[PDB]
Amino acid sequence: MEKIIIYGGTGYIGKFMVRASLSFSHPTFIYARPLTPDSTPSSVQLREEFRSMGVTIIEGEMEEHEKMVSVLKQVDIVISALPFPMISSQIHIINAIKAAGNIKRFLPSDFGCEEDRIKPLPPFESVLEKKRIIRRAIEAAALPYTYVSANCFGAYFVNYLLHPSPHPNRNDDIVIYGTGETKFVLNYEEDIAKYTIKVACDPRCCNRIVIYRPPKNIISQNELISLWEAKSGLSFKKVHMPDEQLVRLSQELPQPQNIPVSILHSIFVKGDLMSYEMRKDDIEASNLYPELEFTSIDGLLDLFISGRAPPPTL
């Protein structure tokens, strides 16, 4: 099987990718920054867990070109799950990949919306521009790539939008962004990870934009809430944050506090995750692997009720 190295492997979505890679029998590696006295105990725990699972951990800084090239010459696929503050640093990955010359595929840290076909409010557009610059650098180096639009991380957004708790109360306030009829897609993290590993090894997805849009996971905030209320057995106080308020906040709030509201405006008001139809060269992943299936929204919510869903995260 193809050998896979993951940057940001100890991250929120990164850890799912590492486990999926191993589960699909791929020799797995991660390039990680050296630990420090302030390293969160969580980051320390994950590295120990990964090592015990057979993951090869290469410790180093992004600026260590020779170290990165040496490792990349030993693998076939590179997947980056680095966070926004580290997006620009991916240029070092691109340079090490080109120097190595043996890499079959590079998946930059996209995993969101399809940045090349949307234009959100200034605060969000600014961060998206960093990801676009990485894409332009990939194209300039002529590297084999796959740009993944994973759409909404399932557990991440259910926690954010519904904040499930042991004992819900009528007054545990539910916020609806915009009017709530805008369609978006919610995909469970474990599935996003599994499909990403398959996609990275699939020749059909080389040098292509791949979108995770399983038909059963397309939903509006109002539909999601109705489903959640039916399952939770109670009616929540629902409040709206209309388009105008989100726009106003994106302009009046300081940075980076103005980014969250800008992202919510893009996803739930402009509907940038469903305001476009699949293109010719565009690939929808749920149609690719008969052996795989995206967990339905109903299934994702049951995961939360059963108390087996990922915990809240920043």
Ligand X SMILES: NC(=O)c1ccc[n+]([C@@H]2O[C@H](COP(=O)([O-])OP(=O)(O)OC[C@H]3O[C@@H](n4cnc5c(N)ncnc54)[C@H](OP(=O)(O)O)[C@@H]3O)[C@@H](O)[C@H]2O)c1
CB closer to ligand X out of 84 and 289: 84
In this structure, is the dihedral angle defined by the CA atoms of residues 58, 63, 64 and 65, taken in order, positive or negative?
A: positive
CB closer to ligand X out of 65 and 237: 65
3-state SS of 94-156? HHHHHHHCCCCEEECCCCCCCHHHCCCCHHHHHHHHHHHHHHHHHHHHCCCEEEEECCEEHHH
Task: Report the candidate in 273, 287, 284, 277 with the shortest Cα–Cα distance to residue 115.
Answer: 273
Q: What are the φ and ψ backbone dihedral angles of 220, each rounded to 5 degrees?
A: -105, 165
The Cα–Cα gap between 113 and 271 comes to 10
Q: 15, 131, 194, 270: which is the annotated catalytic residue?
A: 131
Site for ligand X in 28-87 (CB under 6 A): 32-33, 43, 81-84, 86
Stretch that binds ligand X, among 95-103, 106-114, 214-222, 225-233 (CB under 6 A): 106-114
CB of 192 to ligand X, least distance (A): 8
CB closer to ligand X out of 75 and 113: 113
CB of 209 to ligand X, least distance (A): 15
Dihedral of CA atoms 105, 109, 112, 116 in degrees, nearest 10, equals -70
Contact 312, 161 (CB under 8 A): no
131 is a catalytic site residue: yes
Among 77, 112, 177, 197, binds ligand X (CB under 6 A): 112
Residues 6+ positions from 259 with CB-CB distance below 8 Å: 123, 124, 127
152 is a contact residue toward ligand X (CB under 6 A)? yes
> In this chain, which residue has its C-beta nearest to ligand X?
11
According to DSSP, residue 205 is labeled G
CB of 93 to ligand X, least distance (A): 12
CB of 111 to ligand X, least distance (A): 4
120 is a contact residue toward ligand X (CB under 6 A)? no
109 is a contact residue toward ligand X (CB under 6 A)? yes
Site for ligand X in 11-30 (CB under 6 A): 11-14
111 is a contact residue toward ligand X (CB under 6 A)? yes
The residue with tokens 């486990």 is 19
Among 24, 91, 156, 223, binds ligand X (CB under 6 A): 156
Tell me which residues touch ligand X (CB under 6 A): 8-14, 32-33, 43, 81-84, 86, 109, 111-112, 150, 152-153, 156
Q: Which active-site residues does the annotation give?
A: 131
